[PDB]
Design a protein around this nucleic acid. Structure first.
Ligand SMILES: [Mg+2]
Ligand SMILES: [Mg+2]
Ligand SMILES: [Mg+2]
Ligand SMILES: [Mg+2]
Ligand SMILES: [Mg+2]
Ligand SMILES: [Mg+2]
Ligand SMILES: [Mg+2]
Ligand SMILES: [Mg+2]
Ligand SMILES: [Mg+2]
Ligand SMILES: [Mg+2]
Ligand SMILES: [Mg+2]
Ligand SMILES: [Mg+2]
Ligand SMILES: [Mg+2]
Ligand SMILES: [Mg+2]
Ligand SMILES: [Mg+2]
Ligand SMILES: [Mg+2]
Ligand SMILES: [Mg+2]
Ligand SMILES: [Mg+2]
Ligand SMILES: [Mg+2]
Ligand SMILES: [Mg+2]
Ligand SMILES: [Mg+2]
Ligand SMILES: [Mg+2]
Ligand SMILES: [Mg+2]
Ligand SMILES: [Mg+2]
Ligand SMILES: [Mg+2]
Ligand SMILES: [Mg+2]
Ligand SMILES: [Mg+2]
Ligand SMILES: [Mg+2]
Ligand SMILES: [Mg+2]
Ligand SMILES: [Mg+2]
Ligand SMILES: [Mg+2]
Ligand SMILES: [Mg+2]
Ligand SMILES: [Mg+2]
Ligand SMILES: [Mg+2]
Ligand SMILES: [Mg+2]
Ligand SMILES: [Mg+2]
Ligand SMILES: [Mg+2]
Ligand SMILES: [Mg+2]
Ligand SMILES: [Mg+2]
Ligand SMILES: [Mg+2]
Lengths: 122, 26, 206, 46, 87, 97, 179, 41, 149
RNA sequence: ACCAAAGCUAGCUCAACAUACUAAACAAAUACAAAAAUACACCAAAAUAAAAUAAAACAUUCACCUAACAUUAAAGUAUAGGAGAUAGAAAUUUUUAUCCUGACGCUAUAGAGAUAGUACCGUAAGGGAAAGAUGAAAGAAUAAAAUAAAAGUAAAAAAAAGCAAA
RNA sequence: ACGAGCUACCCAUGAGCAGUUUAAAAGAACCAACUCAUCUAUGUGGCAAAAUAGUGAGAAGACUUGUAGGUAGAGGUGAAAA
RNA sequence: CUCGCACACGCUUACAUCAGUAACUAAUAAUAUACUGAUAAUUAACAACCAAUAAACCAAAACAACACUAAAACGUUUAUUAAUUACAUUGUUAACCCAACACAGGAGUGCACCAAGGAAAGAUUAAAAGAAGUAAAAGGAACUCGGCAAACACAAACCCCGCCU
């Protein structure tokens, strides 16, 4: 009576049953019944130049660690936006209506990589 | 496991009897 | 790599993921639960590397060094004091290397020893005015410092030579971060000059 | 003739009769799945 | 092994064909003409990073087709494995 | 019939502990306390068993009447089955009639 | 450039290979984003080499020379992924304030449970989708008995766990009367 | 309150001490010993 | 990247770019005979041929010509002590063939040392000599030879 | 002398208190043939519980029978019933707050089925097990210490005659 | 509640029937593949919870048979054997 | 002595190499495709996945010339718009499946009767009874309920009951 505990896999079924193993599709089916692959769906790998870059995958044993402070939204605000806001308020040029000069963005859909929809994979 | 001391002591008496039967004392 | 143990299990000074422990207990067996008195981590005052004294056994009054502690069964191991004598080199035609092995000791046979007078003294954890947690004796009223011991890796940070794949301390502690409100995505894309003009269409989420 | 071989295996028939989708198209099959979950089954269906 | 080319084993009927049957009186030939398909274009090879493959594909096409057709001529002419080839 | 081969550890139980020394202290709370509280509310136990005694059928009926809306699904079904079986056995079966 | 999968040839026949410590989170926080982007590939090539060496040691029936290097490397990968995730979710908390990267809803499925249903990307809306309307997110009236029985079962399980811990405390206090 | 009989060894031995000299399975099996001891008495 | 939700593609969307790769690659010695142009890799489930080609072309700068993949199935026959089937994990094997006639032969990653072999042979001879010394004299007949007289 | 035997633990059972009630994990994929990123839709629904039983049969009837209203009495009362079996109120009354919670419940054929709804039997709904015993240390296996007591065998086949014994 | 993956009957979609006799692909004839199971002998805790050997009937049709779907028990289905 | 090779369905690593088998699997050994451990493997061109919207269409497949009745599966061009751009995903092992079993049973399709597959006897002796086969003087159904079975025969007639397949 078959195997219930075994995972349902394309290796198990007939020629009709063809299931992917988790890869991402890169195209569609074209005019002649062939597969037309879209270059836009291909993940273009982004690599830097590592020849003129000096760092190593292992850390010196005598190099000390640090007190673990996780990055906080309050700390990021106090480090990035707070000097500009404080300088503009002490100079009298602070504008509560427009905050685009301090790094704030009202709507995400203008820019290329959104945050809440998570437009970028990695 | 059975709760009881009487069975254990009564078996110890039989164990002493069996030991005396097996190896007789001088 | 973390090894998951069965819920009821017995400790016998072997490493739980080791071949000696696999020979001792196979995965298909279980043994009786030993009564282990719970000692909290803020109450456990015995560490490894400091001088203790044995009170009970074949030897009494001797002093030695703690090399291993077994926390789960509440054991301390003294170095070569409580001995039983075993063979290691084993083949058919030859036996050799009779080695002293040391039996485990639980906490009731051990009091911690103050460095001055070399007597056993009851020890409590106290909080001083400097914010550090230092053990304090009952009788002598001295504080006992912590036993700085070598680690399991066997590598001291004082004497070390960097390999071809090791980062220097200066490059490790060098700060290059500029905390700006752009993502790593935007930073690397503008850093290498990748230019993209078009934008994504509307994508619905349910 | 000879018996014992009433089970002629077919994955199409198996997944169409006892499949997850076939269980969830009917409220009675849904209640079957809830009974298997209450019992704590490793495999709720085929 | 020939599987590493890649080549794959398949089973169907064994046919030896000249382009006609045996009763056709024209059991010899003059020339062949072979068009390259879309997948084997020079532009496709340069996209696939293939320099000498342009010559290799033409070589393989000729070596396969002309040998198969000359063997077809030889076996409609009655020559086979233990008769070898007279001319 | 194989009995154990070792003597067990003898249970050193003391007759003078806190519970055995203070057992049944206020049993005469009404008698020596100008009757204000009965010995009923010294009983620590279930809600339906405090100061009450009966056979198994009356016990099950009383449990279903007091804490019946707070029992479990399977326990309530089992108690209903036990009530039905005890009713049938106590009424329709017996010797002395 | 296929030799980067292997070590340098001087180190092939050595039983013990010393290496430095894993990358610490506080050391990751001091670097810039381009530094993290380059360090990811620097770690990636070393991890590929270590996995290749692990597979070859499994193949030739010899122990892997100091296999803790792979553990240190994967710890470094976890640390760098973690600090990038701190930078991203902190920056998203400043810009939008949404806690999660993926949209989702707390839903009542047909089974009676409460499920955090994550959303998916579709080119067409929800009412027009053929696949989505045959999904059901609600509980029928017959499901309530099974929901109650699930509650009853977990209540019994925690009741026995609490009584078990109480019994173990009693047994230890009776076993060792040091008080 | 679960109660079990612990002296069952002595219970069977008080019968089997009178049947040690029998032939067959009556000197060992307790079911066959009781009927043999009864007829003997 | 693996284990990450991917952007939906309609007409006119920008280029999908992956910056920190979640894939990890094993380079394995073939158990069977393979030609000179072929290099064998173990890759995860979610790889395509174009993904591995871009991986080798950009990260490692290898001029590959052809990529052919297959999925190898792990054994689920083996049973535990409590008789639940233990499954070896399935993996993916990819064969690449190089373009410019580049030659790859698998190097010997474990060369034995002559000095280490000589030291091991000397230790084995010392152990055999210790066993020969520990072998009792047959003419003693089991009498312990510790005592002088 | 083999086969065997012995442990005291894992854990359950009944309550009480109690917040207030579908645990944990959710990075990805999950109701395409579940665990398969990606296309013009359809979506959804309710209708009294019945019978085995008792009335020694069985037709009207047959307490509980998955609808919260508790206790002391009225009261097994008035009533309803092939006025048979049986069913059965109400009007009217009593109930002092918290702590003092653990066990004249079990110890591996017992206590939950549970080491587990897992192996295994079933197409499916479903049914559903048995299985542990050394010590402080086995990083003391030329390893040591306590029963050698069930049926079954061996040590040790049988010698006229008979419920096998007296 | 679950069952038409065996079987009873339908809806789709396919695949097989060589030789011989005849103006015939005629619910004709001989006989294979194929489908049933007439008779006998073994088997009866068996090779088998219905089989083996010999012998038999049809074999261009109201024939077998692959895949898949449908009809569900106060019922389905039935060239009625309850 | 001759159920072979492959595909579809179904099984799920049981396949291949090395090493071991005191014991576990083969209803017994030898050893190993059926046990144990480690390591590898099946690479697409074959197969799956692989456009609709309107319109001209009565005229069978049976070597199809042309016919019969039971009236018959199987697609073209015309127009409209169909992302245009190397390399997508998936099945590639086996002595295998359903029968509690390494079961004399069941099992669809394409080409073959061998160029491929295999072994009825573990070793003796040759008693009775039992199964299978061959042969038989003279007789030829006298046996039996019945010419059941067997046989160098393999034919010719009369009834009963149902027309027949
Ligand atoms: Mg099954
Ligand atoms: Mg398949
Ligand atoms: Mg297949
Ligand atoms: Mg293509
Ligand atoms: Mg069956
Ligand atoms: Mg493939
Ligand atoms: Mg009646
Ligand atoms: Mg009756
Ligand atoms: Mg009723
Ligand atoms: Mg009336
Ligand atoms: Mg009457
Ligand atoms: Mg009232
Ligand atoms: Mg049990
Ligand atoms: Mg005996
Ligand atoms: Mg006599
Ligand atoms: Mg059906
Ligand atoms: Mg059918
Ligand atoms: Mg014919
Ligand atoms: Mg005919
Ligand atoms: Mg005929
Ligand atoms: Mg029939
Ligand atoms: Mg036959
Ligand atoms: Mg015959
Ligand atoms: Mg015929
Ligand atoms: Mg009917
Ligand atoms: Mg009839
Ligand atoms: Mg009849
Ligand atoms: Mg199987
Ligand atoms: Mg054997
Ligand atoms: Mg094959
Ligand atoms: Mg024989
Ligand atoms: Mg004979
Ligand atoms: Mg004969
Ligand atoms: Mg004859
Ligand atoms: Mg004759
Ligand atoms: Mg006659
Ligand atoms: Mg005949
Ligand atoms: Mg005749
Ligand atoms: Mg005749
Ligand atoms: Mg007829």
């Amino acid at each position: 009576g078959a195997d219930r505990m075994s995972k349902w896999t394309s290796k198990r079924g007939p020629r009709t049953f063809c299931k992917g193993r988790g890869a991402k599709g890169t195209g569609f089916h074209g005019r002649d019944g062939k597969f037309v692959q879209i270059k836009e769906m291909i993940p273009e790998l982004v690599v830097p130049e590592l020849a003129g870059f000096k760092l190593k995958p292992y850390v010196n044993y005598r190099a000390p660690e640090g007190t673990d402070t996780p990055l906080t939204a309050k700390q990021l605000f106090l480090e990035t936006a707070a000097p500009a806001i404080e300088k503009d308020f002490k100079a009298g040029t602070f504008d509560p209506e427009h905050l685009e000069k301090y790094g704030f963005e009202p709507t995400q859909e203008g820019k290329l990589f959104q945050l809440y929809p998570k437009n970028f994979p990695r | 496991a059975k709760k009881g001391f009487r069975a254990a002591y009564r078996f110890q008496k039989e164990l002493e009897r069996w030991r005396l039967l097996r190896c007789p004392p001088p | 790599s973390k090894v998951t143990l069965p819920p009821n299990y017995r400790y016998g000074m072997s490493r739980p993921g080791s071949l000696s422990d696999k020979r001792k207990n196979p995965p298909g067996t279980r043994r009786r639960r030993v009564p282990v008195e719970p000692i909290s981590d803020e109450d456990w005052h015995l560490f490894c590397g400091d001088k203790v004294e044995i009170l009970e056994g074949k030897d009494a009054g001797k002093q030695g060094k703690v090399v291993q502690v077994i926390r789960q069964r509440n054991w301390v191991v003294v170095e070569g004091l409580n001995t039983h004598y075993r063979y290691v080199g084993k083949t058919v035609d030859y036996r050799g290397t009779m080695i002293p092995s040391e039996a485990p000791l639980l906490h009731n046979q051990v009091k911690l020893v103050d460095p001055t007078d070399r007597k056993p003294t009851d020890v409590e954890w106290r909080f001083t005015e400097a914010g550090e947690r230092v053990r304090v004796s009952t009788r002598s009223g001295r504080i006992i410092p912590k036993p700085e011991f070598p680690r399991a890796d066997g590598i001291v940070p004082e004497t070390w030579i960097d390999g071809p794949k090791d980062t220097s301390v200066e490059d490790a502690l060098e700060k290059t971060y500029v905390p700006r409100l752009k993502t790593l995505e935007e930073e690397v894309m503008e850093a290498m000059g990748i230019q993209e003009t078009r934008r994504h269409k509307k994508v619905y989420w349910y | 003739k000879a018996r014992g071989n009433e089970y002629q295996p077919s994955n199409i028939k198996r997944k169409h009769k006892h499949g997850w989708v076939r269980r969830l198209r009917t409220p009675t099959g849904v209640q079957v799945i809830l009974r298997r979950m209450h019992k704590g089954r490793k495999s709720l269906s085929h | 092994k020939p599987d590493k080319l890649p080549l794959f084993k398949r089973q169907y009927e064994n046919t030896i064909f000249i382009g006609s049957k045996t009763a056709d009186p024209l059991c010899y030939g003059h020339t062949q003409f072979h068009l390259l398909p879309d997948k084997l274009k020079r532009e496709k090879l340069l996209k696939q990073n293939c320099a000498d493959q342009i010559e290799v594909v033409f070589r393989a096409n000729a070596i396969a087709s002309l040998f198969a057709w000359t063997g077809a001529q030889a076996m409609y002419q009655g020559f086979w494995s233990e008769a070898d080839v007279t001319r | 019939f194989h009995v154990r081969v070792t003597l067990p550890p003898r249970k050193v139980v003391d007759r003078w502990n806190e519970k055995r020394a203070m057992f049944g202290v206020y049993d005469n709370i009404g008698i020596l306390g100008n009757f204000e509280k009965h010995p009923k509310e010294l009983i620590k136990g279930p809600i339906w068993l405090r100061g009450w005694k009966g056979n198994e059928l009356q016990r099950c009926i009383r449990k279903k009447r007091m804490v019946g809306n707070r029992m479990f699904i399977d326990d309530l079904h089992n108690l209903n089955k036990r009530i039905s079986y005890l009713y049938k056995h106590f009424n329709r079966h017996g010797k002395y009639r | 450039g296929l030799e980067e999968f292997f070590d340098d040839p001087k180190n092939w026949g050595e039983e013990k290979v010393k290496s430095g410590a894993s990358w610490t989170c506080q050391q990751l926080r001091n670097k810039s984003n381009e530094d993290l982007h380059k360090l990811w590939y620097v770690l990636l090539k070393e991890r590929n080499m270590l996995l290749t060496l692990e597979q070859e040691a499994k193949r030739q029936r010899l122990p892997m020379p100091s296999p803790e290097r792979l553990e240190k490397v994967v710890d470094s990968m976890d640390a760098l992924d973690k600090v990038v995730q701190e930078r991203e979710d902190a920056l998203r908390l400043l810009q939008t304030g949404q806690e999660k990267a993926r949209p989702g809803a707390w839903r009542r499925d047909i089974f009676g449970r409460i499920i955090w249903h994550k959303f998916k990307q579709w080119p067409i809306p929800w009412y027009l989708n053929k696949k989505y309307n045959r999904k059901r997110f609600f509980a029928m009236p017959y499901v309530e008995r099974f929901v109650r029985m699930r509650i009853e079962k977990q209540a019994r399980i925690k009741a026995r766990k609490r009584s078990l811990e109480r019994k173990k405390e009693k047994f230890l206090q009776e076993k060792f009367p040091h008080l | 309150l679960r109660s079990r009989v612990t002296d069952r060894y002595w219970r069977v031995q008080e019968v089997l001490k009178h049947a040690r000299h029998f032939r067959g399975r009556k000197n060992r099996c307790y079911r066959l010993a009781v009927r043999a001891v009864t007829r003997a008495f | 990247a693996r284990n990450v939700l991917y952007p939906l593609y309609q007409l006119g969307n920008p280029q999908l770019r992956v910056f920190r790769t979640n894939f990890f690659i094993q380079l394995v010695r073939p158990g069977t005979a393979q030609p000179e142009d072929t290099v064998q890799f173990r890759i995860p489930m979610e790889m395509t041929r174009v993904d591995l080609r871009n991986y080798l072309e950009r990260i490692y700068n290898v001029p590959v010509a052809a990529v052919r993949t297959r999925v190898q199935y792990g054994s689920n026959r083996r049973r535990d002590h409590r008789n639940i089937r233990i499954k070896k994990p399935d993996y993916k094997v990819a064969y690449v063939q190089l373009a410019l006639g580049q030659t790859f032969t698998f190097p010997d990653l474990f060369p034995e040392r002559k000095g280490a072999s000589v030291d091991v042979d000397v230790r084995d001879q010392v152990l055999e000599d210790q066993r020969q010394k520990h072998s009792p004299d047959p003419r003693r007949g089991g009498v312990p030879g510790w005592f002088g007289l």
